[PDB]
Amino acid sequence: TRLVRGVYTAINTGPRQTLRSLIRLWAYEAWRIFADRLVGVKEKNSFEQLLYETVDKYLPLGNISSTSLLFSGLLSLDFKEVNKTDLVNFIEERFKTFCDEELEVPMVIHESMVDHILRIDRALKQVQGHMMLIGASRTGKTILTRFVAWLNGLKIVQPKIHRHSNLSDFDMILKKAISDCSLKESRTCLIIDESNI
Amino acid sequence: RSISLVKSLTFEKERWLNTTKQFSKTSQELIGNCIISSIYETYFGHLNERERGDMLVILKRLLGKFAVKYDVNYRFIDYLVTLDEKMKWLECGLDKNDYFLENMSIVMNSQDAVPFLLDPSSHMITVISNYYGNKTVLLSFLEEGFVKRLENAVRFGSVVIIQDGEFFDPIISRLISREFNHAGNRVTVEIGDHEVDVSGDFKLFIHSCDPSGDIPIFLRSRVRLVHFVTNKESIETRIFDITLTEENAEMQRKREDLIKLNTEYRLKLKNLEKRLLEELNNSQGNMLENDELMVTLNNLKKEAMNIEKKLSESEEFFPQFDNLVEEYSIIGKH
Amino acid sequence: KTVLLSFLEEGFVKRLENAVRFGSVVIIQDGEFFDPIISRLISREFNHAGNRVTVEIGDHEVDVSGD
Amino acid sequence: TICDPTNNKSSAMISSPALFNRCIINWMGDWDTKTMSQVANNMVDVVPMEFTDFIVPEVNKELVFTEPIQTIRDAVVNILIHFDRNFYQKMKVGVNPRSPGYFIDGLRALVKLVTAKYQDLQENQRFVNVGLEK
Amino acid sequence: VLKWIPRNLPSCLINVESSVTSVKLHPNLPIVFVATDHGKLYAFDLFNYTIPLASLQSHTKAITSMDVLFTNYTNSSKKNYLVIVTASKDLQIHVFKWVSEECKFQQIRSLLGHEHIVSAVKIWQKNNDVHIASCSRDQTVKIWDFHNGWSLKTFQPHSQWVRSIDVLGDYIISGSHDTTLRLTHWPSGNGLSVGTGHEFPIEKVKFIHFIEDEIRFRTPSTDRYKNWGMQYCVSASRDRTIKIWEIPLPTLAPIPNPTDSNFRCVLTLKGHLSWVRDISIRGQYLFSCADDKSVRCWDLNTGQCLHVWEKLHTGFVNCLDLDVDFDSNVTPRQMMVTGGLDCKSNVFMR
Amino acid sequence: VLKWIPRNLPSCLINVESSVTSVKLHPNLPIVFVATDHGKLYAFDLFNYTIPLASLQSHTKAITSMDVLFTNYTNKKNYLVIVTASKDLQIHVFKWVSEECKFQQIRSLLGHEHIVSAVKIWQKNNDVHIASCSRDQTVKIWDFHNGWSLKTFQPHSQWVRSIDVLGDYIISGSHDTTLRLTHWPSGNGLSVGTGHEFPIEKVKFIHFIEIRFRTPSTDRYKNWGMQYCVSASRDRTIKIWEIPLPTLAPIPSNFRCVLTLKGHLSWVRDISIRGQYLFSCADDKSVRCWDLNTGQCLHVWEKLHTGFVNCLDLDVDFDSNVTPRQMMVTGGLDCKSNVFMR
Ligand SMILES: Nc1ncnc2c1ncn2[C@@H]1O[C@H](COP(=O)(O)OP(=O)(O)O)[C@@H](O)[C@H]1O
C-alpha cells in the first residue's frame, strides 16, 4: 500500500511518462519501500537481481541499480530522473549557502550522501512521514537531516535533554512543539536522538 | 679576515654539504613519516605499548606493500617533539617515561578535538595547571553551578578542566562538536538555553580518574581519548629515584644538575647553529663587503666553542651515575 | 561639515542636538529670535561626567563631542 | 536517530510496534569502501604529495579500493583504508558499526602535517644552498 | 525604446576573477560597475572590456549589495558626481565618488553601525538632500545622511532579519528572512501594513513605479492611489515564485488602516525552477533571473513568459540591471547587464 | 586591435626581491606572474601591485623558465596551470586558485639530470602535455594527467637551450649555433639548419593568422600548417627562417633564412610576435620593435632597465581562446617588471 501511494505521487507530480521511465520509476519506488531496510551487501545484491528477474517475468530497460535511479524534485518542477553531476553541483552550492546561514560544517560531498539526501527528501514530502535513521556515529545523520529540513522550510526542533531532567521537561517540550504545529501552523521536523531517551 | 672566517666555517660547510646530499632521502621518506605520525596521533591514544608495536608493524607492512618509503628508524618523539617542548613539559612535572611523553605530545597536539584524559592518579591535572600556570578553572560534572561558571570561562577565555568526565552532561554538546555560529565578526555557541560569545582563546579539557568507566557514544566518538597509565619503566624509575634519594642524595643532585645543564647546553648550541646559518643567509652582499657579518660569525663560533666545551667537560662524570644506577636494578626488577 | 539652522524654523532642537553629538560647526540664523532653550550652550555650563562632558539642553542630557 | 541498534533502549525503540509500523526505516549502516575512497580523494587533493619518484606497486585487484594505482595519492588512500580496516579487525570491536571518526580525523591530521613538514623541508634546503654558495 | 527586448545572445562577455555579487550600469556613460565576493569593486568600459578601467579592494569580506546615484543639486553651485555605495559582510557601508577624468574609485566616506552583515543598501536624492538606507542581518533598518555621514533614523520592521528594501518617496517596503513584506513610513518610523503569502524567505522586493502611458500594473486605479503615488509592488522569493501585490492605502504621518492592514496578492508568476534572485521592470516587461542558470522576460500584461535565456550562465545568476524608465534624469537606454556565479557577466546592447 | 604599439613609459612598475628570470601574463585576468632567481614565484594584481597577491617559495635554486595554459575541457571545470622549471632538476606544476589567491601544487615532474632550461605546455582535446629540455641534451615529454614521462629523444649533440611546440612538431635551439626540427610523437628528425655564430637563446614557431610571414605561400604549407619560424642567438642577430616541407612519421631538407633583422648591441634574450610586429629585447638594456613585413626597426625603448632585459610577454594572437589584449610586460635583471597597459 506504500508502494502504490508512492507510484501515484511520482506519476501525479511528474512529467510525461514513457514505458521505460514508468518502469524505472516503479523500480525506484521498490527500492525505497523494500530494500532500504536491508543491512548487508549480499541482501542488496539479491534484491537487485530480484528486480531484474521480476521485470523480465512480467514487464519485458536500462540499469536499475540502487545508484542508477536518482529521481528528484530538487532540480526541476516535476519529479523526474536527474543527472548525477548536476545534482552534486546543486547540492554543493546549496550546502555552502546552508553553512553560511545556519551552521558551518566543513563536510565533503559524495555519492552516498546524495542517495541518502534524496530518500530523506522523499520521506519528508509525505503526509505523516516519519523516519528512523540507524547507522554509525559521525556518518552525517543529524546534520544531513537538518540540511534537508532547511531545504524544505521546516522548523528544526532538538529537545534539550540533559542530566538532572525528567519526563516533566520532555512533556513540556513535546507540548510546545505540538502547540506550535497546530496553533501557529509551524511545519516542524522534530529530531529525537537515542541518547535523549 | 676572510681566510680565517672561511677556515673556521669549513665545519659548517661540511655539515651543510652532508645535509643537502641527504636531502634526496629526506624528501623520499617524508610522506611515509607523515602517514605514520598522523595515524599514531589518531589511533594510538588509548593503546598500550604492545598494541602500539603491533599496529606499527601492521602499518609498516602496508607501507611496504604499497611502495611508500619511510624512515626505518622512525621514532614518534624524535620526529615530532622538540627540545623546548620536552624541557617545559618536564618542568611542569611530567614523568621522564617515554610513554607519558608520547601521550603528552599527542594530547597537546589535539588542536581540533576536545582531548579526553584518563588519569587514575590525577597527575595530569597538576601538569596542565603548571603548564598554564594561572587562569585555570576546575569544574565538575558532579557539582552545582557548573553551567554558569563554564559560561563565564567561555566568555573570558580561561582554560577549563572538567573533572569526573564519566558523568558527561550533553548540555555542553555544542562545545564537543565545536558547532559554532560565525555571526559576522564574532563566533558564538549555543549552550544551555541561550547563545554565548566564544572569546576564541578558550580551551577545554575533560578528565576522568575512573578507568573502565562509561563514556557515552556521542562523547566517545568525538574526543581524542588518551590513556595516562603507569608501566614497568615508570615504576622502576620512581623506585630508583626513591632508593637514590634515601641512600645518596649528593649523587641525586649532581645527576639532576648535570642532566639539566647538558640539555640546556644542547638547546643553546642548536639555536646558535640556527642563528649562524640565518646570519650567513641574509648577508646583503659578500662577507668581505659586510665586516659586521664577519665579526658576528666569529663571535657566534666563539660562543659555540664555549658551549660545546662546557658540555663535553660536564659529560665526563656520568658513567659514575651509570654504575650507581646499575647497583639497584635488583630492586627495580623485584 | 557646516550646518545652517534658524531660530525661526521647526526641527531646530533635534538638528542642534545631532550637531552637538557629532561635532559639526553650527550657524543659527535669525539670532534676534533667540530661544532660551539652548541657554546652557551660551553659558557653557557643562557637566564634566568623569571622562565625558555633557550638556543639558531641551529636556535631557546630550554628549558634547568637544569639536 | 539511532547509533547502536544492539543497545537495550535502541532495541526497544526499533522493535516497538508503535514506531515500527509508522516510520520508514532507513538503514544508514556505515561507510563502505567506495565512500571512504571518495572522501579520501577529496581530502588529499590539496596536499603537495607528488614531489618524489613513485613506482606503481604490483597488488591484487581485491587490495585496491580505488581506480588502478598510478599516483602516490592512490597508494596513500589505499593504505589508509586498509589500516582502518585492520585496526577495527585486530582491536576486535565485534560487529559494532564501523564509525568513520578515526578515518576522518587521521585524514585531516595528515593534510596539516604534510603541509607543515614539506614547508620546513623546502626552507631548510634553500638556506643550506645559500650558505654553501656564499 | 521601452519596447526593446535584449537579443538572444550577449553583446559582450566580461570576465572577472571570482563570483559576481552585483552589477550596475553607469547612468550616462557606457560603463558597468561590478562587485565581487572578495570585497573588490571594478569599473569596465563596454567597448574595451578586455582590460578593467579600474578596480579597488575596499572591503575585506564579500560585497553583498551595490547601489549608485548620480546627483542633481539645484543650482547649489556644486559639481554633480556619481556616488557609488557598497555594503559588505564586514558590517560596513562604503561611499565612493567616481572620478571620470581619472577613471578611479575615490572614497568619500564610510558608514558604521550594524551588528551583522548588510543584505541591501539603497541611495536616493530629494531636492538638495541625499540619503543612504540599509538593512542587515541584525534585523534593523537604518537611514544615514549622505553629506553629514551619520545616522538619521533607525527602526526594526521584522522579528526576523531583513533581506531587501526599496524606497519610494517617504516610504520603505522591506522583505525579510520571514515570509512577510512590510510597508513602513520612514520619516516617522511607523509600520503601516504587512503582506503575507510566501512560503520561503524573500529575496527581493521593489516598488512598481507609474509610467506616463496603457500598462496593467503601472497606473493608478483611483484618484486616492494616484494622489498617494503608489498602487502596486512586486516581490520574489525562494519558493520559485514572483508575486504582484496591490498595496493597501493608509489614511492620509500616515495612520495604519485598521481594516486594510494586509496586502492583496493580485497576480502570481511561476516558471522558474529554483530560487528567484533578481527582478526588474522595463516598459511593459518584467525581467527576472533564478538559481537555474536562466533569465526570463515576462509580459506584465498577462503574467506569462515571453522569452527565456536558458543556460545563459554556467552557474547561478546573481544580479540583473536595467535603466530607469520612471525618471526624467535617466535615459532608458537599450542596455541590460546580467552577472552570475560563473565569474562572468553578460552585457546586452542595442 | 593587433595594430597596437606600447607607449614609451610603462603604466606600472613592480619591484621584487631580486633579478627577474621569467614573467608570464595571466591569460584572462589582470594578473602577472613573476618567477625570480631565488626560486620564488609571485602573483601581482596590476591595479594593486605593491604587496604581492601571493608569494611562494617553490624551488631551492633559480627558476629558468615557466609557461601557462588555461585548460579547455570538453566535459570537469577549467583552471589555469602553471609549470615552473628550475636549476634543481625539477619541474613543479601548480594550479592557480583565484578564489584564495594561492598556488596549489598539483605535482612535480622528475627525470632530467641537469638544469632544465625551457618548458612548453599545450593541450590536445582533453589531453594536456608538458615538454621540456635541459643541459643533459635530452628532450622529454610528460603526460599531465598521468604524472610520468611519455616520450624521450635527443635532437642535438649540444644541449638544448630552448624549444617551442606547434601541432605535433618541435624546433629545438641548441647550445650550438644550429637549430633542428623534429617530429614530436616519433623523435624522427626532419630538418636542420645553421647561420648563427653563437648559442641560440630563443626559437619559436610563426603561426598563420589572417602579413608577410604569417600566411602559407603554397597549398602544401597550408596543408602542413606551418611555413616559417624565428630564432635569435648571442650573435646579436634575429633570423626568420623558412621551414622545408618533408616527405608527407614524415621522412626527410635545410632551414632557409628568408629575412635577417639586426640592430641590437648585445645578446638577444626574447622574441615575441604580435600581429604585424616583432618585439624583442637584448642584453643592451633596451627593448625594440621591428616591422614583420619590411624588416625595419620601428621603435626603440632605451634604458627600460638598468640591467639586462630577460623576458617579454605578449598575448597569443593565433588562438580563438586567447583575447589579444593591448598589454605587454617586460622584466629584467634589476628587480623590476615594467607593465605597459593601453
Ligand atoms: N560525508 C562526510 N564527510 C566528512 N565528514 C563527515 C561526513 N559525515 C560525517 N562526518 C563527520 O561526522 C560529524 C557530522 O555527523 P553527525 O551528523 O554529527 O553524525 P551523528 O550526529 O549522527 O553522530 C562531523 O564531525 C563530520 O566531520
Residue numbers in the entry:
A (entry chain A): 2623 to 2682, 2686 to 2822
B (entry chain A): 3291 to 3624
C (entry chain D): 3425 to 3491
D (entry chain A): 2890 to 3023
E (entry chain F): 139 to 351, 354 to 392, 397 to 494
F (entry chain B): 139 to 213, 216 to 350, 355 to 392, 397 to 400, 405 to 494
Task: Provide the authors' own sentences about this structure as they appear in the paper.
Using this subset of particles, we solved a structure of two dynein motor domains in complex with two Lis1 dimers to 4.1 Å. We called this structure ‘Chi’ because the dynein conformation resembles the Greek letter Chi, and because Chi follows Phi in the Greek alphabet. In our structure, two dynein motor domains, each bound by a Lis1 dimer, come together through dynein–Lis1 interactions which, to the best of our knowledge, have not been previously reported. This arrangement is consistent with previous studies that have reported the binding of two Lis1 dimers to dynein in solution. In Chi, the Lis1 proteins bound to the dynein motor domains act as wedges that keep the two dyneins apart, preventing most of the interactions that stabilize Phi. The one exception is a contact between dynein’s stalk helices, which acts as a hinge where Phi opens to accommodate Lis1 and transition to Chi. The dynein–dynein Phi contacts that are disrupted in Chi are replaced by new contacts between Lis1 bound to sitering on one dynein and the AAA5 and AAA6 domains of the opposite dynein. The AAA5 and AAA6 Chi-specific interactions involve residues on Lis1’s β-propeller that are different from those involved in all previously characterized Lis1–dynein and Lis1–Lis1 contacts. The Lis1 bound to sitestalk does not interact with the opposite dynein molecule in Chi. In contrast, in Chi, the linker is disengaged from AAA2 and AAA3 and shifted towards the opposing dynein molecule; this accommodates the increased distance between the motor domains caused by the presence of Lis1. The major features of the Chi structure—the disruption of most Phi-stabilizing interactions, a shift in the linker–linker interface, and the dependence of these on the presence of Lis1 and new interactions between Lis1 and dynein—suggest that Chi is an early intermediate in the activation of dynein that provides a mechanistic explanation for the role of Lis1 in this process.
Cytoplasmic dynein-1 (dynein) is the main minus-end-directed microtubule motor responsible for transporting vesicles, protein complexes, RNAs, organelles, and viruses along microtubules. Dynein is autoinhibited and undergoes conformational changes to form an active complex that consists of one or two dynein dimers, the dynactin complex, and activating adapter(s). Dynein function in vivo also requires Lis1, which is an essential positive regulator of dynein, as shown by genetic studies in many organisms. Lis1 is required for active dynein complexes to form, but how it enables this is unclear.
